[PDB]
Paper text:
We also determined the unliganded crystal structure of BDBV-289 Fab to 3.0-Å resolution to compare the conformations of the CDR loops prior to GP engagement. The structure of the unliganded BDBV-289 Fab is very similar to BDBV-289 Fab bound to EBOV GPΔMuc, with a root-mean-square deviation (RMSD) of 1.6 Å for the Fv portions of the HC and light chain (LC). There is a slight shift of the CDRL3 to accommodate the α2-β17 loop in the glycan cap and a larger shift of CDRH3. In the GP-bound structure, the CDRH3 loop moves toward GP by an average distance of ~3.3 Å. In the crystal structure, this movement is blocked by a crystal lattice interaction, but this difference may indicate flexibility in the tip of this loop.
To determine the structural basis of neutralization and synergy behind glycan cap antibody-based enhancement of base-region-binding antibodies, we solved eight structures of glycan cap antibodies in complex with mucin deleted (ΔMuc) EBOV GP (Makona) and BDBV GPΔMuc. Antibody contacts are focused on the β17 strand of GP1 from residues 268–280, with the majority of contacts centered around W275, which, when mutated to alanine, abrogates binding. Through molecular mimicry, the CDRH3 or CDRH2 loops of each of the neutralizing glycan cap antibodies characterized in this study bury analogous hydrophobic residues in the cradle, displacing the anchor.
Numbering used by the authors:
A (entry chain B): 1 to 211
B (entry chain A): 1 to 143, 147 to 202, 206 to 229
The structure:
């Protein structure tokens, strides 16, 4: 068992049942240990061995083995279960410990929501300092996964872009932001600068220009 | 019954070294091994190493051998992890945990290695920047009924925490404070927006960056 692999992300509805898989080479000898990690806190042992569920953890979680594969089954798939689940094992050759890549379980708790995009160009006062930054703010989109792509006169731009991971607490609908930093000369060089926010299969676009 | 408490967060130079601690409450170390595992912002868990305080010898991961040093002291019942030659790629949360290797002899004699107790985690942040005061710029509005948006862009401030209050905290009509973004220079840049009827009132955002003791009021006049 030199490596463990598992799907990066999986999605299920609020009442569905999810079965996250962890496939490795040493899972024949070793039982997979399953940990739940929520964003700002340390992992929690959610399952180990066989039928050994730690105290306090709900009864939705179950472990299963089948040779080189292990699986964690969550029957309820409740909103609190939305998190990152990691599988863990011990190497046989050496005492090195192997961790799976992690699976991000997203429980679809709310209806889908379209992203609201607003693009602010570089304020004239900022241009006084010989700097410019386009601000593309996305709000109220569910599920909370979006991808931002900047363009300059029908030409995708890749440098100077810094994007925020979506996150919102006012409501379950998420929010994110993206910053395109550039100098005034670059901004006044092109005729247009576009922010394309792609959510699900849809793509919203907000364009600005030096005017 | 058992508990692991780590040391506080640490911002460290990109050429320095950290020594994060991991003190155990209740049960002593014993045979149960102490594992150090780190997690980078947005990435997954990365096993760094482990030690058995009873024997004293440790074993590190393949890529860390030479940099990391895992120690154990029974007098204070504390595990330590020293990491030298720091760099931005080492910015991460470092957890210590109690790893409990176990076996089930029935059947095929199968093993299982779990970690029941963890420490709260220690954030080690490696940046070349120093405490910097924010620069506030006005994101003005421009031409659904009404609901025009205007905001304030805080930029180039290194210390993580920063606050923004519209009209000295009197305005809360759709005011959102997006999480800041870490730019290439290691300096954070945040935005604070607000939507109001296109119709008069005075809109002033007050940014408070307590670390560097910076306070800046800013009027967002339209075009």
């Amino acid at each position: 068992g030199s490596e463990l692999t598992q799907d990066p992300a999986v999605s299920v509805a609020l009442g569905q049942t999810v079965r996250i898989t962890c496939q490795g080479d040493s899972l024949r000898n070793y039982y997979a240990s399953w940990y739940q990690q929520k964003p700002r806190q340390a992992p929690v042992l959610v399952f180990y061995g066989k039928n050994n569920r730690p105290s306090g953890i709900p009864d939705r979680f179950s472990g299963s083995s089948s040779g080189n594969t292990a699986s964690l089954t969550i029957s309820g798939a409740q909103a609190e279960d939305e998190a990152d689940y990691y599988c863990n094992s011990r190497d046989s050759s050496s005492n090195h410990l192997v961790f799976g890549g992690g699976t991000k379980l997203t429980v679809l708790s709310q209806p889908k929501a379209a992203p609201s995009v607003t693009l602010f160009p570089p304020s004239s006062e900022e241009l006084q300092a010989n700097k410019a930054t386009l601000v593309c703010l996305i709000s109220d989109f569910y599920p909370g996964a979006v991808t931002v792509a900047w363009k300059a006169d029908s030409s995708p731009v890749k440098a100077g872009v810094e994007t925020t991971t979506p996150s919102k607490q006012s409501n379950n609908k998420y929010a994110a932001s993206s910053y395109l930093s550039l100098t005034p000369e670059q901004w006044k060089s092109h005729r247009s600068y576009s922010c394309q926010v792609t959510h699900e299969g849809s793509t919203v676009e907000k364009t600005v220009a030096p005017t | 019954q058992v508990q692991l408490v780590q040391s506080g967060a640490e911002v460290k130079k990109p050429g320095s070294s950290v020594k994060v601690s991991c003190k155990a409450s209740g049960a002593t170390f014993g045979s149960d091994t102490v594992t150090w595992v780190r997690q980078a912002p947005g990435q997954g868990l990365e096993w760094m190493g482990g030690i058995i305080p009873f024997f004293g010898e440790a074993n590190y991961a393949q890529r860390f051998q030479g940099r990391v040093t895992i120690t154990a002291d029974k007098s204070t019942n504390t595990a330590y992890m020293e990491l030298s030659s720091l760099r931005s790629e080492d910015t991460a949360v470092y957890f210590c945990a109690r790893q409990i290797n176990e076996m089930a002899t029935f059947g095929e004699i199968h093993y299982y290695t779990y970690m029941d107790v963890w420490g709260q985690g220690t954030l080690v942040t490696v940046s070349s920047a120093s405490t910097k005061g924010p620069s506030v710029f006005p994101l003005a509005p421009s031409s659904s009924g009404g609901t025009a948006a205007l905001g304030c862009l805080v930029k180039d401030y290194f210390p993580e925490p920063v606050t923004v209050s519209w009209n000295s905290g009197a305005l809360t009509s759709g005011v959102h404070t997006f999480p800041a973004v870490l730019q290439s220079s290691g300096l954070y840049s945040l935005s604070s927006v607000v939507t109001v009827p296109s119709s008069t009132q005075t809109y002033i955002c007050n940014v408070n960056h307590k670390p560097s003791n910076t306070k800046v009021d800013k009027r967002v006049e339209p075009k």
